[PDB]
From Swiss-Prot, chain B:
Organism superkingdom: Bacteria
Protein name according to UniProt: ATP synthase subunit b
Organism: Pseudomonas aeruginosa (strain UCBPP-PA14)
Protein task: F(1)F(0) ATP synthase produces ATP from ADP in the presence of a proton or sodium gradient. F-type ATPases consist of two structural domains, F(1) containing the extramembraneous catalytic core and F(0) containing the membrane proton channel, linked together by a central stalk and a peripheral stalk. During catalysis, ATP synthesis in the catalytic domain of F(1) is coupled via a rotary mechanism of the central stalk subunits to proton translocation. Component of the F(0) channel, it forms part of the peripheral stalk, linking F(1) to F(0).
Subcellular location: Cell inner membrane
Family of this protein: Belongs to the ATPase B chain family.
This protein's encoding gene: atpF
Amino acid sequence: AGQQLREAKAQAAEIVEQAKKRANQIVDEARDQARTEGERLKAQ
Amino acid sequence: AQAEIEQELNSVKDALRAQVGALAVTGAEKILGASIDANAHEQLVSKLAAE
């Protein structure tokens, strides 16, 4: 009973860490697209 | 991307304005340096004496 709780708790931490890792990709890809469009408009 | 486009646009008008203002002052100096003679002092020294 204790072993499966420790296993589930270890997987719970991994699920939340993968979500944090994913959030940074979502935010930095938006920054690079928005800055690139800003340069597209600035050159024109 | 929008405010900065207006930032450059107005700065260019000011760069032109700085040269046009110098030319307009130079023009006024050249005009007065030919349009003024003895007929102007009787309309300027006389004016100052009331001020």
